[PDB]
Each structure stands twice: as structure tokens, then as C-alpha cells.
Design a protein around this nucleic acid. Sequence first.
DNA 1: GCTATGAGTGGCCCCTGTGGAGAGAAGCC
DNA 2: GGGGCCACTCATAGC
RNA 3: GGCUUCUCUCCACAGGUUUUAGAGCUAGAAAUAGCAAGUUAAAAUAAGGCUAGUCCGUUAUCAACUUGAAAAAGUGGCACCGAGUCGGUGCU
Length: 1296
Amino acid sequence: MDKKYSIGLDIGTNSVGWAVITDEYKVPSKKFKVLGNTDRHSIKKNLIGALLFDSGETAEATRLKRTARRRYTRRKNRICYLQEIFSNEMAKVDDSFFHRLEESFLVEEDKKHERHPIFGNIVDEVAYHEKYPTIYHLRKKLVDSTDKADLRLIYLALAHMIKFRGHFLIEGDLNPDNSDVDKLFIQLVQTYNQLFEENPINASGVDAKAILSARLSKSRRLENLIAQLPGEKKNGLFGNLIALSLGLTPNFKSNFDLAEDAKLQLSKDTYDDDLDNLLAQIGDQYADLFLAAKNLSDAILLSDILRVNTEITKAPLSASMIKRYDEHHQDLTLLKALVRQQLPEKYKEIFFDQSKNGYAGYIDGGASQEEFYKFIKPILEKMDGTEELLVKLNREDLLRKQRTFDNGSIPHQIHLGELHAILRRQEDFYPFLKDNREKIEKILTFRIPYYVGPLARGNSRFAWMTRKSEETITPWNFEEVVDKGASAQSFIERMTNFDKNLPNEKVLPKHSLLYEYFTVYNELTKVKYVTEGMRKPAFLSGEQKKAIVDLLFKTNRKVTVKQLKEDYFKKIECFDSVEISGVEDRFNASLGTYHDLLKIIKDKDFLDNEENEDILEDIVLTLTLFEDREMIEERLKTYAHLFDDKVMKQLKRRRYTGWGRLSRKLINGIRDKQSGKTILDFLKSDGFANRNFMQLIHDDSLTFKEDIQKAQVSGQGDSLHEHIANLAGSPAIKKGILQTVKVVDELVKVMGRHKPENIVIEMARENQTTQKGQKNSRERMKRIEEGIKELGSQILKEHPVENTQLQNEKLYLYYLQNGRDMYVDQELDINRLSDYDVDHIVPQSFLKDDSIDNKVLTRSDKNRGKSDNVPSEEVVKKMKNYWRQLLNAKLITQRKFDNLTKAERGGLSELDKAGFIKRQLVETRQITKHVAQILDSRMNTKYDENDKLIREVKVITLKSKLVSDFRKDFQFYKVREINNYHHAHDAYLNAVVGTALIKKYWDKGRDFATVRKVLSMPQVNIVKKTEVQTGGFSKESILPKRNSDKLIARKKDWDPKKYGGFDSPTVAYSVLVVAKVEKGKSKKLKSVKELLGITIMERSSFEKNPIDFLEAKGYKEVKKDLIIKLPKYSLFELENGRKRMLASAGELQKGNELALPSKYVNFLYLASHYEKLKGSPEDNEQKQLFVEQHKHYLDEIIEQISEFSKRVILADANLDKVLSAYNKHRDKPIREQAENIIHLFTLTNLGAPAAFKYFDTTIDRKRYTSTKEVLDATLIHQSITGLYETRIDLSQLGGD
DNA sequence: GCTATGAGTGGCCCCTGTGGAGAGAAGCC
DNA sequence: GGGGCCACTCATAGC
RNA sequence: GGCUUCUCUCCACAGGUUUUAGAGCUAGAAAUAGCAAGUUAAAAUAAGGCUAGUCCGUUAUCAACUUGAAAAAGUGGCACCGAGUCGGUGCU
């Protein structure tokens, strides 16, 4: 009698609840064998439990570090290339120069050559450092001087330029000489006036320098400048020119009456060709206009970077840095003088103390610029004569370093120009420089284009480059070796999906011709027409379809029903009145690509000839795959013999995007065995059948369907669970799905292999991490600062906003609205905000949202003003302008503004009200379907004689709202902060409710009593999944030198005492080792038994040969058989049932779960929401009275917490602190008592101890920092469900 | 009487900022 | 959020 | 049909940190006191690995025992009456 049973499952991002129930909702208990060496051979357990595990991580950090590693290697290569070029000459002047550069990081003890790196003698070094204080001085000297300089300084200059070459965002050559904004603006205006003498622009008196160099958005600057020009418009020709100079993408369709879109952008690489196209349409007279526009753009960008450099030289960057240094020097002198003359006492503080934020800290210490300004600002204002200093302080220009974080804006072309200037000046003296000028310039300019990828020789899983010849790739010969076009093709292809019906075929591009034919014939396939005298609608014949397509689809971009009726039925077939069914006013499919190719090639027969189909498809695929025009030219050169040069150029300009769903082989590649026709052939002509694509692929009379189920191959690349890896979602849900599958398998194993009747699955809600949320909070902080600065509200500058005020939606939303209510606009003060209530934009009942964007601040009275309705429309209108102002401040999110516009439109109607309610209830529930499918596939594996899957097992999906309603109705409250039994209880309720509802489509006496018994069980299996830690070797910050053995070397020969290094390696896992250690100065052998930590860095070394690794650490006479591998969260048991989990080699976590009787849980839930009951007033009052009557349970709860703590926690001081705090607040209101008590369980929660707040008193965490006591505990190994246990007593191992 | 350790307790510490190019899947409309 | 490291203070076992 | 959000891959940039070099001077046995100076540079940026690449090294996977290089496979009785981390009784 296989006991019929059902299994419940609760899948979350961190836990998997599992429960086994019979038909009577009872949870059976069984007696289980226990292996090991203890006396406890049989333990009885309940069939319920929940599995806890660490959340998975995505791959983002790994990708970031991998890319960084590649950059570092390639930069080292560039330095190597320059040194390789210079080696032959540098050998004659100073042989050891490169050794000195290479070993400079070593101490004087370990250097092999003389200690000064550059010249190796002190006098030359001192003279050099006095003559050129910074490398930029050397750069300017070499640029301007015509004299022969020492080769070593040339190497220094070239190396500094190469190793910090700067960004590549701006493409194309740039002229540094264009640095006058006003001059070039005037020149552009004069050119416009000359070409438009009839419409001169009055730009006299306009300070374009201030407007264009203003630190605003590009569109705002465009509006600002045009507003100062009378009669000129934003979208006008001159407005478009100014937008171009600002770096935007103006449209010149309208200004020149053009047929097609005319967008030009200087930052685009194709500016030359597009500008040439525009000139070919409007005339070559306007070329000077756009050249002046380009000059203006260059001036704008350079003045924005370099802040108005004056003196004429080919090296503006070096001059700017030197000027900055000189101003720094002068201001330091002035500040010293003033401080010493007025405030002598603080001189030592500002100029000597490194730990502070003074100047000494700003230079020698770790202080950044912002901190130095913050510390120095108040002192300057208390002294006299600091006007210039304060002005420079507000401008971020006082005492500025040369190497600062603003340099990210420097285009590389500046460095390229300085390089070329140096080489040109010094080429006369050094002949070898002349021949290698192009090589040296290209080393700076070259980069690997993004579509090629790593240049790997097959041994890297990330690589896709196809190499022509097996030579080593160098920056000078990149073109000859790497096939760029095939590289790009592969780069696009490998990311694309595959056809579902033919998994081994690639999908065709969206604008492929055959796709358009397929869609047109598919739509026309089911079109029915009714003429006079017809009793029934008739399908269109193949001849009719051919005629209609040839007449309309090849002649018009879009064909409508009226067009068909007036063009084919009446003109060709002579039918006056015809009814068309199934077609909605137009056909979705259109031959847009065909019409475009007709416009380009201008040959109807070439397009209509089926022999050209392959050529056209390859051309379309070429247009889809490649986005750089040069490659397109390269591949189209194959068909250049079929098209003239202008046609060739036209094709290079068109672009298509998107990919379809069906492959070529599926539609026109496979042929029916009986007929020889493809799906396209049948759609063109199917006779009386007129079978569509769905019918053709599902018709049993054709070979297409049969070949389809032939192709369906249940392949599992690598392991089978790789199917799970292919699902849509974060790995956080995916790890849980895999655990759920294995748990189901083990439950089936335990029950006796008889299959479960039914399975209930349900999904919980995801929670983001605290640290990453904190970084989000910091970004939101800086955005708040930007917004408030645009507002000008001064309240924030007195007190900087705290991360909690961001996390607390109230203050953050206060800053979003600039202290103005969003329903109805009035000034609001934060003290009044404490009273005010926050409300969703959408009415609460209609739709609820967890996100902060929907939940917006409002004043309490207007919050009460409207309920279950959108805000009144007129006040939303008056708020809309202020909302636009906030959007310009970027304070309010765009989606929030969309919600506001939805509110003003009115949005929800009664049917749409029901839609929004059902829509808050509904979750995307798409991953859930895949989980259900996987479980169904694993369970139901038998096919009937008709090859139909026999469904013995029914997979069920429910929604959390039903279970929540069930809990609320019958007072099965749950509180998360108590313990981990909540997941198990949720799974149990899921199973019960699912089975009940399926049977209905229940004894209210017996069933509820059974359920209350089930929720009252103290024994629930909680297992923490053991995991071997992996990840970084240590913390990434390098710490200074100090006398300790706990530092880890950065390199093999870099002693930490002399060079410092990393700290705090993360222990992969600990091993129990019994051996002998020499202790004392006598080196006496002592038998010891201790835990040794294995670092992640050493893991391979330990696993390769444990004995040698243990020996090298100083242990002797290691017993190999006793090497027991103990991962993180390994479980130990001590006396009195006190349990611990091994956090690492030296710290432990609490290991026991508090079993709290259910009546206390109900009381706490009722007390916590005493003022937030959502129900009938009568039941609310009954609950309130029930809370009042059982007030004495509070002392009961304190008693149970105290007893549990004294039994398993051992936190004497913290427990005494808690007890002392409790008596102090014994007259507080009950609700506050409950909310504080809820926080109290954090002491007794499973896992790592954490601090908590109790009323006003804060309790620090108690940490178990000694692992001696578990060396004689009972080790427990738990199977993934915790049902099977093997107990090993370590006290009998390695006795003294 | 003098030496050395170890054990616990409290407190501080943790790499960050950006741009460009793409193939894919889902919120609200 | 949680493990690592350090200064200090007491204790402790041996000698 | 539109939008943004999220997963995954590549190419770049700007910093930060570490050590060393940039003659500290004067009085003073020293402690120390005064005075001057400070902005830059080289190298490393997970230990390293063999497949020697202008490549690879932080994702995912992991109770114990037996067989396996690994992937993987095999290994653990039932019923009833009770419940403070599960206990007792009968059958096998």
C-alpha cells in the first residue's frame, strides 16, 4: 500500500522549503538510521524542513577584473615595444639605464646597479630635478628647444606619453590651434551672412564665449545662445549649426527641403562621407559653412578642457599644467605667509600633521582634494586678504595637483601632436628616429577594435578571431594577419539565437527578402473574399496571390484593404463590390526592403529573377552584420561587377537592424519528399487546401512535421543541468531551482521511490544587498546634490544628507520636491513632514508597488483628500510645470513623470481598474513555468502505447496572495524575525491549499486542528548548505610595511617586512590535523590537535600533496588518515544540545533555533500592527482586546529568551544588558514594547552574530573567537535534506 | 619572584569614477 | 554585512 | 507596435595604493627646538600557470561511505501512541 502523499516546495533566492503531506494533511514521522561511531543509532524526525544557502553571485566582477588584466598586459607590451626600438642606440650611451628603470622598486640593498635610476650619480640627478621639476616641463622643453638633447630624456618623454595616452572617444583629427570661441563664432556668423545676405543674423553684443563654455547641457546651451539672436529659431539652419558645434546630431531634411533624413554628427566616424552626401544634394557652396561649424566645435571643446591658454606653442597641455603648478607655488607661499602672520599656533597643524586633512595630509597623507578644501575653507574665511583664495576655492582651482581625476577628458590627439612635434624637432640628430616615426606614432594610435576580440591562438574560451597566417601579431602589421570581416561576422553570429524548429540553423535577418515573401504569402493565405453571387467566402488561389503581390506589393510600400478592393478586384477581376475578411484595414507584411532595393539598383528583372536570390540574401546579410562601412565595401566588392559605382555607393549607405525567428532551411531549404515543394512553394500555391505555415509544419501528410520531430534532439551539452543554466533570470533564482530539483529527488528516495501524487511550487520575493544598495545610495546622494544646486535651496548645505535619509523615502522625496507638496503645491517643513504621510501615485487599492518611484511624498491632508482614485486632474495640470522643473533638476525619475502623466490623463477606468488590480496581483511567472516543466519531465517519464506522456504527477502553480489570505483569515500569522521555520510553514500551507483547491474543483472541524498541530511542532529540520569558499585571494588594499608574520608578499622575492602587501586571506576550508609541534626555545615535540586554515591561494598546493604542505608549516608526524575536510558552515554539537557552525578556522556562529510557541507569535503579530489592522472594525476591536488581556505574555517571552540564551548562547553580559533595559521601559506602550522585542530575537537568530537596537540602548555583537571547545565535539554531516546523518565524535580521535 | 603565553574585549577596516559597441529577455504603455 | 587584525588587560601555568 | 530596466561578451580611459629617487639645513651628546621644502617620476596591480598566446587565473558546480580522472553511478525497514529540537511501544 504505497501511501499516497504530496510534496510542497517554496523556492526563494536564499531558501528552499520542502514538506511532505498525506491525504489527511498530517505530516508523517519516520525512524531513520544514523551512521558513525556514536551510541545514537536511530533518530526519529518529522518529514518537514527548509534548506538555507548563500545567495549566488552574477559574473560582473569577474568580467571587470578580466578586462582590467588585459589592459595592463597590453600597456606593458607598448612599453616593451618602445624599449625594443630604442635598445640598439641606448646600448651605446648608457647600458644599465633599462636595468635601473626596471629595478627601481627594489631597496638599495637589493639593487644590482647604482641607486639613482636616471643618471646613476647624485649630481646629475639633482641638477635634473631642479631644472625640470615635473615631466611636463621636460615635454615643453623638448617641444620648443631646437638643441640636441640627451637621449634618455627623450625616452622619458616618449614613455610618459605612451603609458598615459588618454581616451579615444573623439574620432578623427582635431586641430588644437582652434581655441578662440568668439573668433570662430564670428567667422561662422559672417559666412552665414555671406551665404544668406537676404537674412543677416544680428549677433553683435552676444557673448557666445560665456554661453557655449557654460557648464550646462548641450540642448540648454543651444537654447541659451539662440534666445540671444533675434529672429533665429532652435530648429533653424543656424540653430542646427550651433547644435552641430555643440556635438549634437542636427537634421538638415527640413532646412534644405530634402526628401530623406539628413543627420550629421562630428563625433561620428562617417562625418566626411555624410557631409559629402549633403553637399552633393544642396551644393558645394556650403562647405565653408560646415568647416566653420567644425572649427567652432573644436574651439568649444578645447576651451572647455584647457580653460583659456594664451601663449603660442604647439604644446598647450604642457603649458597649462606648468601654469597650474606656478599658481600652486605662489598660493602656497601666500598662504604660509598669511597663516604665520595671523594664526601662528596652527602652523604645525596645517603643515606638519599627516593624519589630519590639512595641507600635510593633502600632500603626504591619503587626503583627497575635496577633503582638503572642506578643511581649509573655514580657516581662510576667518583671516584677512583671502578674496582671491576664496574665489579660487569655489572654482576648484586652489593648490591643484598636476595629476588629478579631471584628466579623463583629454583626447589622445593632444598627446599625438606633442609626440610628432618632439620627433620632428629631434629627428635631425638621431637618424634611427627618422625611419621609425610612423612606428612610434602608430604604437600610440593603435588599439584592438572592439569587434575583433582577444588575439588568442585557440586556447581561450572567449576568443573568436580568425587568423590568416601563424605569425606573431604586432601593432605595425595588424592589417595583414587578422581577417577583420570574418571576425565581425563571427562576432555578431555567435551572440545570435538559433531557430527553435531547426536548432542547428542560424536565424535570418529581419529585413531578409525571403522573410518578407513568407510573411506576405502567409497573410494572404487565409484572406477570404465575397463577390456578388457567392454563397461562401473563397480562398485566394496561387495565381490570384501571384497577381496581387506582383501588382501591389512590388509597387507600393504599404497596401491596404481599400487599395486591394479598388486595384485588383475591380480593375483586374472586374468585380464591383467585394468583402474582405480577416484583414484589418492593411496588411502587416510589406516589401519595404524590395522597394528600397528597387529604388537603389533600379532593375526590376534583376530583383524578380530567382537566380539572384542568393546574391540579394548575401547583400542583405552584409548590410545587417557590419556597421563599419569599410568592411561593407570590402565584401560588396565581390558583386561590384554586377553594379555600377553609384549603385555600389548607394548600397554602402543603407542599414538594417533586427533578426527574425525562422531559418532559411526551414522555409525554403527543406522540400517535401512527395511533392518536392518547400513551405514557400506551398504558400505560393496550395490549391483548395491553402494550408498556412502552422498547418504545413503540423500537417501529418507532409514530411516537414516528421523531419521536425526528427530534428528535436534531447541533447544536454556538458551536464544536464545546463538546461537550467539556459533559463531567463539572475543566477540567484537558478541556484535555488537546482537545489529544489535535488531535494525532490532525495524525498522520492526516502519515501520508497513511489512517485508523489501532486507537487505544489510557489515563488517568493527577491531582496537586494545592503552594500550595493549603499553604493546606489551614494550615487543617489550625488544626484540629489546636483538637483538641489540647480534648485538653490540652502537647507541642505548646513547638514550633508545622510544615507538613511536617502533610504528613508520621506527625506529623499522631500529633496526631490524641493520641500513642496506634490498633490497641491505649498512649502513644507521637515518637522511637518514627520506628520505627513507618503502615498503612491497609483491608488493603493488599485495597484501597489514596492519600488520607491511609485511611492511618492505628499502632505497628509491632501493624501486623505483623494482615495481609490487618481489625483484630480486640474491640480495635476498646475503641478505639471513644477514637475518639469524637477525633471530638469533630474530629481524625479522619468518613470515617475510617466506615472504623473498617466494620472493627468485619468488612466484607469472601471474595467481598467479591474485590470490594474489583477495586474498588481500578477507576477511575470515565466521562470516558474520552466521549473514546472523540468519537474514534470523528471517525474512523468512513461509513454503510453500511443507515445503520449502518461501524467501520473500533476505540477501545480499557485500565488502567494492566496496563502497570505488563508493565513490572515484563520490567524496563522508568521513573523520573519523569530527563526527560520517560516519557510517550512509556507511550503506546508502551499501544499495543503493546492491539494484542497484541486479536490474541490474539507472538514472545518478536524482539518484546522490538524493544521494547528502541524504548525506547533518544535522539531523542524534546518540545514545550512556547506560551501567551499572561493573568490579573491585577499583584500585588495596594499598595506604599509610593519613587523608581522601576517602579511602576504606581492611577488616571489618581495619580503613583506620590506615591501608590505596584502592582508586577510579568505580561508577556503579548514582541516582537522593531529600531529606534533616543536614548541618553546627547546624545540620540544608535543602532541597537539588543532585546526589549520588553508588559504584559497594555497588550495592547489595542498590538494596536490597534503603531507609536504603540512610539513612545511612546521607540523611533524602528521597522521594522514585523520585529515578531515571541514568546509564552511560545518556543523558541530556540544553538551546540552548547544550547536555551533564553523565560520572559518577561528570563528563560530550560533547553531540552534528558538522554538517559540505559536500563541506568542500571534500575540506579537497583533501587537506589532496594533494601529495598522486592515479589516472589519469588530474583528479589529476583538484583536485589540485580545492583545490587552494577554499582556503578561511579555514577561513570558522575556523568560523564554533568557532561558534559551543561558542554554545555548552564553552571552552573559549582553543578556544582563537586555534585562536591565527591559525593566527600564516597562511602562512604555505595548506597541513599542512589541517592536523592540521583535528586534530582540536578533541575538538568538541562526548565523553570524550581529548588533541590534533595543529602545535607545545599543548592544554590540558577541563573537565566538575560539575554536578549541569544538575539537572534542560531535561532528555532523547532513545530507541535502538533513534526513540522513553521519555522526563522528572527534573526542576519540588523536587522544594524548 | 620572574617568564611566557593565551584568552577575552573593544574598536577599526574593507579599491573607486567614467565611455564606447553589441546579441538576448521583461515593468508599465 | 561579516571576517581579520591590533592594543590592552587579566589570567594562567610553569619555574 | 513603443519604452526603459536587467543578464552576458569585448575594447578603452582616469585615478588610488605600495617602495624607491628627488643631497633637508642650523643649534644640540641625545631627546629635542627653530627654519626650509612639499605638486613629479619608475615598476607592480590578485601568488602565478603551460598550451608560450600581445593567452589564461575571483561565474556556475561541492553531505558522508563504495566505485570512478572527472562527469557520473551505487549505499540507509515498517506500523501506532505521544511531543521543547524529538520520545516510547510492536512487527522485520
